[PDB]
Symmetry: D3
Subunit: 143 residues, 6 copies
């Protein structure tokens, strides 16, 4: 009746992959400062990218019932969308194994988004993170 992860012993090896997205909504001046170049913290996108990559590799340590796993590839892409007053985060994780990497992609997108928040905090106190969701995973889902 309480937490207990599932066995992945008999699941066979395969090429797994997943992609997620995240958004940080902010004021025009706030985003403008990211493009211009930046807040007193430094390179916003570069720092969020690295944070997201490191976080993906530590997903097994942050999510109690996830399994550790040898990530073969992690990508974090950031794109300013001034027309929407926000930043778009897209992530990609891949590996050869049994277990999929949906949580690793979601975690990398979430932590990238938190890092953008951190670097812009002083300038705006009501930035909103979301939505955060899967785009594709690999039957399976795609986008």
């Amino acid at each position: 009746g309480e937490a207990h992860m599932v066995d992945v012993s008999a699941k066979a090896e395969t090429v797994r992959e997943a992609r997620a997205e995240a958004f940080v909504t902010m004021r025009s001046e706030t985003l403008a400062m990211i493009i211009d170049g930046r807040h007193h913290k430094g390179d916003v996108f570069a720092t969020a990218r690295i944070a997201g990559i490191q976080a993906a590799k530590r997903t097994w340590d942050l999510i109690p019932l996830c399994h550790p796993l040898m990530l073969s590839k992690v990508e974090v892409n950031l794109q300013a969308e001034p027309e929407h007053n926000r930043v778009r985060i897209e992530t990609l994780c891949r590996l050869t194994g049994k277990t999929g990497v949906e949580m690793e992609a979601l975690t990398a997108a979430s932590v990238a988004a938190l890092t953008i928040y951190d670097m812009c905090k002083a300038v705006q106190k009501d930035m909103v993170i979301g939505p955060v969701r899967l785009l594709a995973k690999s039957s399976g889902d795609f986008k």
Copy 2:
């Protein structure tokens, strides 16, 4: 022109606090299973609560330019909202120091939300996390 955290030496000691919220939107059956009792993973809320608390304490390790800090109190509350087909997460962090704890509260809410996602994954592939935002921080902001 690149990442460089700010000095907190001369900032004085004070009682800092911050509260954040997060939501995980899902299908009725999915939420119903959390209330009933649960998915094959186990106690959803109890596991998300612990994940969120542990994550708050590791915020300095996940967010590159955050400073380590002696958290005096962390709370993660979860509440099923069947009328909205979603789960509400509310967090609270507190400590006596100079630096505020806005990122710790946000990170605990985000990781709690990721853990709910993880425990329900198998049942629904299009759950959405968000919004994720501050409610209060302590001038300052309140809610």
Copy 3:
């Protein structure tokens, strides 16, 4: 003449498993509070279970000469034994590899036991942890 781990290169892949047990001895009132429901800290068993699972995954980081390894399954079961004024912890770890998982099962049982201690500390200052030992490992040993 000093620390140096052994090579596991030529060892072949196999289905490894191990089970351990641990006990926390306490006063009747202390255990009664775990059953009733609880100390001011919260759900004792649920929290000890998660701690134990997370600890098993970090065994390679806590024990200097252990090797990192892709755990396929970790279980932590807790059972109140009022007739003996104590809590029984039983763990199970499994994976497909060369290296066995005796230390992972032992570490998960030890940390679960420490967490029970932590949640009950205020109520009793002389709780005792032990014994802590293997039950089964997989020639090999069984119980």
Copy 4:
């Protein structure tokens, strides 16, 4: 009704300290090898000492509801007791703060004991760890 750590804000600063003990019981040949000098793994005591010290500093990360805290001193002492076919572990933790360090001393003793187990595993499959308990903490308790 679920996990929630207590607030340590208003608790005042003080000199805290705690001592714990742990024992690993084994066969004469096994202990003899520790004294002689050692198993194929290397210096048993030296490795267990370091593991225990590092573990004490990470107690806040292993025990969900513990608070992080600036340890000012950690000691791990090991002593072969051939007359009892076992190893005795005694630990000491100290710091200036509000929160006591009972869990840090207990965790350092437990991980030291696990490391002794690890280094001797191959030679004996039924070593037993325990008891593990406090000796002193600082009203308070003493020994």
Copy 5:
């Protein structure tokens, strides 16, 4: 006769600081690629900077007898020196406490240097890291 850290209880609070330097020597083409812009890995300096900052905060976890400590400021500066076929790393750590931060500055410089190495590996197999040393610490030393 074995590892045992010293007590920092009675040491008084003060403003501590330390600066270190590190160098990575390489071929002209290799450095040229860092300036131009880069290897297939990405922004070399930006990534080394973040790695170094994160590493400084984890020094207590990497160096067995160091004490954890609330860093108030960490800086990692990188500068291409084409005239010497190498990269210069300069770091700065600061905090208010008893314990100095010489190891944190040295560790941030070392890990920054390792990250530069990592990003350029494929292009040159004989890059050399060093020297790595203190410049200033705060009696005390200066440069």
Copy 6:
């Protein structure tokens, strides 16, 4: 144009290995104290050895674009060289996989060197670490 690790999916499995070296230069009295036996910190070599081994296993967490990987063997050897007023560190890492272990060997040598520095700090303020470089990796390079 920013950090992005490469895919290791299609790379095939092989026996990888790498060796690195590091040196810590110091005064005769300082080295003499390591040989004699030691500083107030304890066993210098034994502590540096363990630090280096643990660090190798955490290389993926310290170097942003490295991939996690199941180390099958890590060795850290230390040798006093009184004729040169310095300590020589030689490391060896090995595993069966696609990715090589050059960074793991380099990181273990660097952290071993930092630990020697830490244990001798009080006695000499101008010790120098370096050079730090590969000796062999496995076409490939050898020494």
